[PDB]
Design an enzyme around this catalytic site. Structure first.
Site, mmCIF file in Angstrom:
data_model
loop_
_atom_site.group_PDB
_atom_site.id
_atom_site.type_symbol
_atom_site.label_atom_id
_atom_site.label_comp_id
_atom_site.label_asym_id
_atom_site.label_seq_id
_atom_site.Cartn_x
_atom_site.Cartn_y
_atom_site.Cartn_z
ATOM 1 N N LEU E 40 0.666 -1.356 0.357
ATOM 2 C CA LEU E 40 0.369 -0.172 0.090
ATOM 3 C C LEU E 40 1.111 1.202 0.189
ATOM 4 O O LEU E 40 2.252 0.788 -0.050
ATOM 5 C CB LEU E 40 -1.129 -0.425 1.439
ATOM 6 C CG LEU E 40 -2.588 -0.734 0.708
ATOM 7 C CD1 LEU E 40 -3.502 -0.700 2.362
ATOM 8 C CD2 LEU E 40 -2.576 -1.164 -0.344
ATOM 9 N N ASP E 41 0.277 2.772 -0.255
ATOM 10 C CA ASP E 41 0.699 4.160 0.192
ATOM 11 C C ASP E 41 0.069 4.268 1.253
ATOM 12 O O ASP E 41 -0.800 4.038 1.887
ATOM 13 C CB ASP E 41 0.638 4.343 -1.124
ATOM 14 C CG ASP E 41 -0.498 4.717 -1.738
ATOM 15 O OD1 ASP E 41 -1.330 5.058 -0.814
ATOM 16 O OD2 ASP E 41 -0.723 5.772 -2.358
#
Ligand code: CDL
Ligand code: PC1
Ligand code: PC1
Ligand code: 3PE
Ligand code: 3PE
Ligand code: EHZ
Ligand code: MYR
Lengths: 458, 182, 127, 81, 86, 12, 172, 128, 71, 122, 60
Positions: E40-41
């Site tokens: 994810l970010d």
């Protein structure tokens, strides 16, 4: 007369009693003397109760003495928080001042001579500054004595010159004689200053807007015993005086009243508004006392039957509650060792019963019906409204603020969230709770039949 | 806000020489308005003390007893004919519009009644109709007899009181008999 | 960007210390160890037949509950209330004042007996 | 109970009105992240909510029969009286 | 309302994270770090916590939001905030 | 499962 | 200490679509404008130039203040909610317990016995944790409000009593 | 589009709309460093006294004591009889007192004027 | 609270309902629909107006007794 | 209603001033002045406590309504025809009230017709 | 005659729960139910003045 001798008789009582029995012996005899004093509301009709050449009583005095004789037990247990560590002789001399104080107030109200009234009227000062300055807590208690006494004498002394002047002119100043041998006051310029001298002495011991700097400068720093007695009866000494001295100051009273009742009228809103913005808890009741005390200034000035009844009703009722809020001030101050309002908060979650006493105190000072505060205040409004229709917008606007600061102290101290770092408040002893109970019950159970309280004009 | 709007409506009546009709409204309004607040209190408790219509919805079928109470409670609030509300509110409207009164002052009670019904539809649509936007974990329940009896006690009141006060009381206001149809 | 390891190693130290805190906030089965109280005999014979629990047992329990509540809440008030008005308040005149019932044409008075004459012929209005 | 949670398999955007945005969103060029999170409010017994007018006439179906018996009984009473 | 145990709350967070389309329903783990392990970010964390704030009803603070990026440490904060103990 | 509740000392 | 360029947009997004939820109400309506809010958020991901990025903050906030719900939605437990600090009426601090009368602490003996043991842990670990603190404070006091953890075994993390013995969120 | 949200004394400008908040720069960057550093020490010794086992007292706040003096006693020691204080004192002092004098006296003479020939009605005004 | 409630707390499903919970729901719905429009059949006049309102043009000058502009 | 539209938007002389009806002499235009009589007398009208607004010309149809209502207690569903007579009289009171308003309106129209014909006849 | 006594009781019987509360004899639990019964019995007591009213209309 049967009240005074036992009251003096408590002087050997406390001064001799055993090291640990001085407060027990003093507390009981102060409680027993409320018997013989309680037989002073016992009254005939319009004629006053004159039982001696030099002493007399009426329906105006009768509520006052039973207040003072009742009061002394309240300051007795009130002082039993911070006098324990003092030496025996100092403890004994504290009772000496309180008992000496009783002997004075119990005698001013019974005095049938203007000078004899005045001699004892200002004689009550000497016991006071001993209490405020010797047993005071803060630093500026020294400045408290100077502010209190110098304000009082600066007005009382011209009254003494006025009284002897009346003595030489009409012949006597016996409260009955001046009433029966009344004489209208001419509009001569000399009579104006004589009128001003007669009234100003009672004005200073009746906090007026401008002549009230000693109200926050004495009550806040005075000891707990001295605080209530100075706020419950001492402020009323002028109240008794003006109700009596006005019998010889007519018709000059009506024309000369405008500079004074109006200053009370505008300041009574101002002084109440002062309580809305305060940082010291004890300053609230001091300033609240000023506004309530200034309310009866208008009532006496109108010299209206309804106003006099409302003045007397508020006079005793305010004294009882103003003393109460000073006890609640003491308990919180003792636990937190500070007088700052915002310091001790959320106390109701710790002391639920003490919150109820706070609730009843602030709500009675709010003057709801049927409490004696309301009936005294309502009678003033009706008398003031008859005098002028605009009076409602001012004195009504006081009741605006009166409800505000009364609840403001309740909310910020008892209600809300407790401050976490205070690890000093213990459960309240039975002393203060009984002290609060002995303050609240006489006010409530007087409400059923308050006709002992309305006054002689009732 | 509906309470205050109702209060403005009923004291308008005593405004135009209708004291007793104001007292007529004092009894009807106390009946169903308590239901509306009590019903909202019921769904608050079931909906994990949530009280914003954006997260209500879908409770029409989940809580039928409160659903029935509010709809007929709001219908009385809107003036459903021959209900508790109509015998007062619509009788009042029939009275105020036909009188010597201030010009526009008859139009709030006309326009506000339109708004009075307006928020009643909004409260029905958002809170009970629509999709169940509430938090995923459902703890809702209204099967406690204490609720069911409490709502039901005024429920037959909010349905049948209107008649049982209208007929028995002596006639104390002039009856509006002849008026235009509109 | 996230916790810096140290704070976490600390939080779990606070977590387990908090774990034990309200793992000590419960009550053992014996506590509260109820101190003895003097008991009236009234509840003794209420429970002497309550254990059966069948319908009519608890109904008469509620039936006395309603009546015992009634006598001390609706009988003893009206006892002293009726004493208060009929013998103290009504003993003082103008304290209790009554509307005279509205007499209509055709009614009869119990004491006088005279009938108020019926109002004259109606204008015969029919719809 | 031990609070057994419903499994994910029985919950998908298909069937529920959540598709309506999806291909409209797919026309823009993206896809809805939390497509299956709100499907519970649109699926199961939570679906097919009554219309606003339908809620109003709740219980009106029994109003039919109740009116018929009440009026008919009173019609007979008046006719036979 | 009955309280939620550590198993129950870890089970509740298990459902919502598994439902997420960005993650893969077989790689999900209780200690799986969001932005690295699940890929994810930073601008995926924000929508995670509101989806976490939704079914729980309360709001984790923003100051504690940026560091709230581990499923095991997810439940540690919530369990601390509600002091619900099995 | 019930937990001990803290209260101010009401005995006095 | 710092709301750097990272969190500002993260907080801005949080308040943005929460207001949108307060606007759209319906879930299907909210989801469409949420992903548009998301898609329009990262359409300019590659904005290395910080001056434009700070500029892109300006058109994020001023219309957020215009576009925020005039009746913003807040959950009950969070600032502005209908249940914020609702139960403070019941949360009484732990220190009030030792003031209980002998009858009151004999009422619950096991808890008081355990409470005494809890008081022990504070007493002979306080001097250890303050000493541990002092040897790890930077000069001129601490430069950050964060507390250091327990360095070695046995000693509790410094300054732990009140944060551990804090009254429960649901006291009754 | 939308003009602005203009701040006032009671409608303050939020930090989100604050331009200088988004105008971060090196010299104000170190200026906000000691804001928390001062706060950090004030949270340290407070907590140290807060959680001291032998702390049986009230942790006095020097800021609180300073506030009490500043609002109760310090006003006159640092008072100056500048001209502005005189107008403010006069306007809020004898100003309203004389204003109410005009209002009250006018009614009193007007009421006395009316009764002295009997225009005011006191048919049932006895409870004076 | 205690395990074994008459309704069990489920997660994200349609909550279980008891038959008794439903019976009163349409009981009052039917009676309200009975009440509001049975009395409609009783005295429909109330929401109809018992007396028609004639416009003030059709009345002839006989009853009004108002002579024309002739004399 | 319509009267408000013509009075405010248009000329107000064609519409009676609402505080002044009747202005034209009632006797003029109304012969055989057998004035509106009373079936009830103020004695029983006072004995039957009636509020002043209710003390209208329909007084006879309230008193007997109060009678049967009291005697039929608690059967509130009875005494409807007597109630039916009550609003019928109040209806009749309302129509004759309309007749008075329109009679004033017609006189107002005629009063203008009389004056301009007499004015510009030269 | 009955009108004076019944309505006055509806006021008096509404205040005993307050005085019993000050007596602290209530062991919680039963007190809310005890309060409801008094109000409910106050209501039932308050009926017979109302049914009296429509019968005649006396107001004292
Ligand atoms: C007056 C209030 C009466 C009710 C009361 O006590 O409320 C307490 C209540 C506070 O209760 P609380 O908050 O539960 O107190 C919690 C504390 O922890 C303290 O209580 P607790 O938690 O320990 O126990 C719960 C409860 C139970 O009560 C108690 O615990 C305290 C009991 C107080 C009496 C103690 C002595 C009893 C024995 C002697 C008397 C025996 C009777 C015979 C004489 O406490 C209270 O009710 C507090 C009472 C405090 C004294 C109130 C004044 C008493 C009379 C003086 O006070 C209020 O709510 C204020 C109301 C103020 C009046 C508003 C309306 C005034 C209207 C005008 C007056 C009436 C005019 C006439 C109308 C009719 C005309 C025909
Ligand atoms: C109902 C009230 C019942 C009160 C019962 C006693 C409790 C309260 C007593 C307080 C003391 C009252 C004393 C009093 O008024 O006079 C005492 C009186 C006052 O002194 P005295 O007795 O010299 O009074 C002289 C007047 N004669 C001669 C009529 C008695 O003393 C005694 O009664 C002894
Ligand atoms: C019915 C009903 O409610 O009856 C109530 C009853 C009756 O009240 P009542 O006002 O109807 O009085 C009736 C009197 N008889 C019966 C002779 C007609 O209340 C009482 O009896 C007491 C009323 C209060 C009387 C004044 C008491 C003052 C006590 C003060 C003690 C403390 C003194 C020192 C402090 C204060 C100093 C001012
Ligand atoms: C109308 C009736 C009511 C009148 C009320 C107002 C007048 C009240 C009496 C005067 C005011 C007294 C205030 C209390 C005393 C006071 O404020 O003292 C201040 C000061 C104390 O000394 P210190 O602390 O050293 O401060 C020195 C500052 N320069 O001490 C000083 O600075 C010296 C003070 C000397 C004056 C006070 C004592 C005499 C008072 C009467 C003076 C006028 C006599 C007749 C002329
Ligand atoms: C500062 C100190 C006071 C300064 C001002 C003194 C004013 C004195 C006023 C005065 O003496 O007025 C005259 C009046 C009666 O005078 P009389 O004895 O009759 O002689 C013939 C003229 N009438 O005198 C009297 O009636 C005597 C009674 C008043 C005495 C005090 C003076 C008035 C009050 C001053 C202080 C106000 C505060
Ligand atoms: C009511 C609501 C109305 C509507 C209210 C929301 C505003 C709508 C209008 C559009 C305004 C604006 O263009 C976009 C906005 O929202 S804000 C500014 C975003 N500017 C950047 O992103 C550049 C700087 N870059 C970083 O900060 C990092 O790169 C980051 C933390 C994002 C990495 O995270 P990575 O993507 O995980
Ligand atoms: C279209 C049918 C309903 C019309 C309702 C109109 C309400 C406003 C008042 C109109 C004029 C009648 C009252 C006056 O006169």
């Amino acid at each position: 007369l049967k009240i005074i001798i036992p009251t003096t008789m408590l002087l050997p009582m406390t001064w001799m009693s055993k090291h640990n029995m001085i407060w027990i012996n003093a507390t009981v005899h102060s409680l027993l003397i409320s018997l013989i004093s309680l037989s002073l509301l016992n009254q005939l009709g319009e004629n006053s109760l004159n039982f001696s050449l030099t002493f007399f009583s009426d329906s105006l005095s009768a509520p006052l003495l039973v207040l003072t004789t009742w009061l002394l037990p309240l300051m007795l247990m009130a002082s039993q928080s911070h006098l324990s560590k003092e030496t025996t002789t100092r403890k004994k001399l504290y009772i000496t001042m309180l008992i000496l104080l009783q002997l004075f107030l119990i005698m001013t109200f019974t005095a049938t001579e203007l000078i004899l009234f005045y001699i004892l009227f200002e004689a009550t000062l000497v016991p006071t500054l001993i209490i405020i300055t010797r047993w005071g807590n803060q630093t500026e208690r020294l400045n408290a004595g100077l502010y209190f006494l110098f304000y009082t004498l600066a007005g009382s002394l011209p009254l003494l010159v006025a009284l002897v002047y009346i003595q030489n002119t009409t012949g006597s100043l016996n409260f009955l004689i001046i009433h029966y041998w009344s004489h209208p006051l001419s509009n001569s310029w000399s009579n104006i200053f004589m009128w001003l001298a007669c009234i100003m002495a009672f004005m200073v011991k009746m906090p007026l807007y401008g002549l009230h700097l000693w109200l926050p400068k004495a009550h806040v720093e005075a000891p707990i015993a001295g605080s209530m007695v100075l706020a419950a009866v001492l402020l009323k000494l002028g109240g008794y005086g003006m109700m009596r001295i006005t019998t010889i100051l007519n018709p000059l009273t009506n024309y000369m009243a405008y500079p004074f009742l109006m200053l009370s009228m505008w300041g009574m809103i101002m002084t109440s508004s002062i309580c809305l913005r305060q940082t010291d808890l004890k300053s609230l009741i001091a300033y609240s006392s000023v506004s309530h005390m200034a309310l009866v200034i208008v009532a006496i000035m109108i010299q209206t039957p309804w106003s006099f009844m409302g003045a007397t009703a508020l006079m005793i009722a305010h004294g009882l509650t103003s003393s109460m809020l000073f006890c609640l001030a003491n308990t919180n101050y003792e636990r937190v060792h500070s007088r700052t309002m915002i310091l001790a908060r959320g106390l109701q979650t710790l002391l639920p019963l003490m919150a109820t006493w706070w609730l009843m105190a602030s709500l009675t000072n709010l003057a709801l019906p049927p409490s004696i505060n309301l009936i005294g205040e309502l009678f003033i409004i009706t008398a003031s409204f008859s005098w002028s229709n605009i009076t409602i917008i001012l004195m009504g606007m006081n009741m605006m603020i009166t409800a505000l600061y009364s609840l403001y102290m309740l909310i910020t101290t008892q209600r809300g969230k407790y401050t976490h770092h205070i690890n000093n408040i213990k459960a309240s002893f039975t002393r203060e709770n009984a002290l609060m109970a002995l303050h609240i019950l006489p006010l409530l159970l007087l409400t059923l039949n308050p006709k002992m309280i309305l006054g002689p004009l009732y | 806000f509906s309470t205050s709007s109702q209060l403005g409506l009923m004291m308008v009546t005593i405004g135009i020489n209708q004291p007793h009709l104001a007292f007529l409204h004092i009894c009807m309004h106390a009946f169903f308005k308590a239901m509306l607040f009590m019903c909202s209190g019921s769904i608050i408790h079931s909906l994990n003390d949530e009280q914003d219509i954006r997260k209500m919805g879908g409770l029409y079928k989940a809580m039928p007893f409160t659903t029935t109470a509010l709809i007929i409670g709001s219908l009385a609030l809107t003036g459903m004919p021959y209900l508790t509300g109509f015998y007062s509110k619509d009788l009042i409207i029939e009275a105020v519009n036909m009188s010597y009164t201030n010009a526009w002052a008859l139009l709030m009670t006309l326009i506000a009644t339109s708004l009075t019904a307006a928020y009643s539809t909004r409260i029905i649509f958002f809170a009970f109709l629509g999709k169940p936007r509430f938090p995923p974990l459902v703890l809702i329940n209204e099967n406690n007899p204490l609720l069911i009896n409490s709502i039901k006690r005024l429920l037959i009141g909010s349905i049948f009181a209107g008649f049982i006060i209208s007929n028995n009381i002596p006639p104390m206001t002039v009856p509006n008999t002849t008026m235009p149809l509109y | 960007s996230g916790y810096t390891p140290d704070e976490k190693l600390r939080l779990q130290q606070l977590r387990e210390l908090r774990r034990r805190w309200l793992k000590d906030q419960e009550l053992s089965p014996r506590e509260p160890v109820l101190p003895p109280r003097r008991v009236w005999p009234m509840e003794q014979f209420w429970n002497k037949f309550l254990q059966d629990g069948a319908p009519w047992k608890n109904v008469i329990y509620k039936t006395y509950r309603h009546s015992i509540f009634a006598v001390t809440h609706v009988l003893i008030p009206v006892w002293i209330i009726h004493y208060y008005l009929k013998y103290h308040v009504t003993a003082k005149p103008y304290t209790v004042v009554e509307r005279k019932p509205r007499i209509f044409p055709g009614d009869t008075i119990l004491e006088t007996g005279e009938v108020i004459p019926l109002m004259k012929e109606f204008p015969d209005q029919h719809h | 109970s031990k609070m057994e949670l419903p499994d994910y398999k029985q919950w998908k955007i298909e069937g529920t009105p959540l598709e309506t945005v999806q291909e409209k969103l797919a026309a823009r060029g993206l896809r809805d992240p939390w497509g299956r999170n709100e499907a519970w409010r649109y699926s199961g017994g939570f679906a097919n909510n009554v219309s606003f007018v339908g809620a109003l006439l709740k219980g009106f179906k029994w109003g039919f029969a109740a009116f018929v018996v009440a009026v008919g009984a009173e019609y007979y009473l008046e006719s036979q009286n | 309302a009955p309280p939620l145990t550590l198993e129950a709350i870890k089970d509740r967070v298990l459902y919502v994270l598994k439902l997420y389309d960005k993650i893969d329903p077989e790689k999900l783990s209780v200690n799986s770090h969001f932005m690295k392990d699940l890929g994810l970010d930073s601008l995926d964390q924000v929508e995670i916590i509101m989806a976490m704030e939704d079914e729980f009803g309360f709001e984790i603070p923003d100051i504690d939001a940026e560091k709230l990026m581990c499923p095991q440490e997810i439940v540690d904060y919530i369990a601390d905030k509600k002091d619900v103990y099995e | 499962k019930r937990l001990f509740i803290i209260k101010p000392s009401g005995f006095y | 200490a710092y709301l750097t360029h990272q969190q500002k947009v993260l907080r801005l997004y949080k308040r943005a679509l929460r207001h949108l939820e307060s606007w759209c109400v319906h879930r299907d309506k909210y989801r469409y404008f949420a992903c548009l809010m998301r898609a329009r958020f990262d359409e300019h991901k590659n904005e290395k130039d910080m001056v434009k990025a700070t500029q892109l903050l300006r058109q994020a906030e001023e219309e957020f203040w215009y576009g925020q719900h005039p009746q913003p939605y807040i959950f009950p437990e969070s600032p502005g909610g209908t249940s914020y600090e609702r139960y403070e009426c019941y949360k009484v601090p732990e220190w009030c317990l030792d003031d209980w009368h002998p009858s009151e602490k004999a009422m619950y003996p096991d808890y008081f016995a355990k409470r005494e043991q809890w008081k022990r842990l504070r007493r002979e670990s306080w001097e250890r944790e303050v000493k541990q603190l002092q040897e790890e404070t930077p000069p001129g006091g601490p430069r950050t409000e964060a507390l250091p953890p327990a360095r070695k075994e046995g000693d509790l993390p410094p300054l732990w009593w009140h944060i551990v013995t804090r009254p429960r969120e649901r006291p009754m | 589009s939308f003009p602005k949200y203009k701040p006032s004394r009671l409608a303050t400008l939020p930090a989100t709309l604050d331009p200088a908040e988004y105008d971060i720069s090196p010299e104000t960057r170190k200026a906000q460093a000691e804001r928390l550093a001062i706060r950090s020490r004030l949270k340290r010794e407070y907590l140290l006294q807060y959680n001291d086992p032998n702390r049986l007292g009230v942790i006095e706040d020097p800021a609180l004591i300073r506030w009490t003096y500043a609002r109760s006693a310090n006003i006159y020691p640092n008072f100056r009889p500048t001209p502005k204080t005189s107008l403010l004192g006069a306007l809020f002092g004898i100003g309203p007192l004389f204003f109410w004098y005009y209002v009250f006296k006018t009614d009193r003479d007007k009421k006395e004027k009316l009764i002295q020939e009997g225009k005011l009605d006191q048919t049932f005004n006895i409870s004076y | 609270a205690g395990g074994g409630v008459h309704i069990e707390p489920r997660y994200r499903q349609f909550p279980q309902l008891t038959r008794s919970q439903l019976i009163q729901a349409e009981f009052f719905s039917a009676t309200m629909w009975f009440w509001i429009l049975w009395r409609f059949w009783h005295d429909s006049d109330a929401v109809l107006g018992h007396f028609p309102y004639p416009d003030p043009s059709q009345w002839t000058d006989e009853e009004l007794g108002i002579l024309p502009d002739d004399e | 209603g319509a009267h408000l539209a013509r009075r405010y938007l248009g000329d107000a002389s064609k519409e009676p001033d609402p505080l002044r009806m009747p202005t034209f002499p009632p006797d003029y235009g109304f012969p055989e002045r057998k004035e509106r009589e009373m079936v009830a007398t103020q004695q029983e009208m006072n004995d039957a406590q009636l509020m002043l607004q209710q003390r209208d010309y329909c007084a006879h149809y309230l008193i007997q309504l109060l009678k049967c209502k009291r005697d039929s207690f608690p059967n509130f569903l009875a005494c409807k025809h007597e109630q039916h007579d009550w609003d019928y009289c109040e209806h009749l009171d309302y129509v004759k009230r309309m007749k008075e308003f329109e009679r004033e309106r017609r006189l107002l129209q005629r009063k203008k017709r009389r004056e301009q014909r007499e004015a510009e006849m030269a | 005659n009955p009108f004076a006594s019944l309505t006055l009781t509806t006021l008096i019987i509404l205040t005993i729960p307050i005085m019993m509360s000050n007596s602290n004899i209530y062991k919680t639990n039963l007190y809310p139910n005890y309060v409801k019964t008094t109000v409910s019995y106050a209501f039932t007591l308050s009926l017979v003045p109302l049914l009296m009213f429509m019968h005649t209309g006396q107001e004292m």
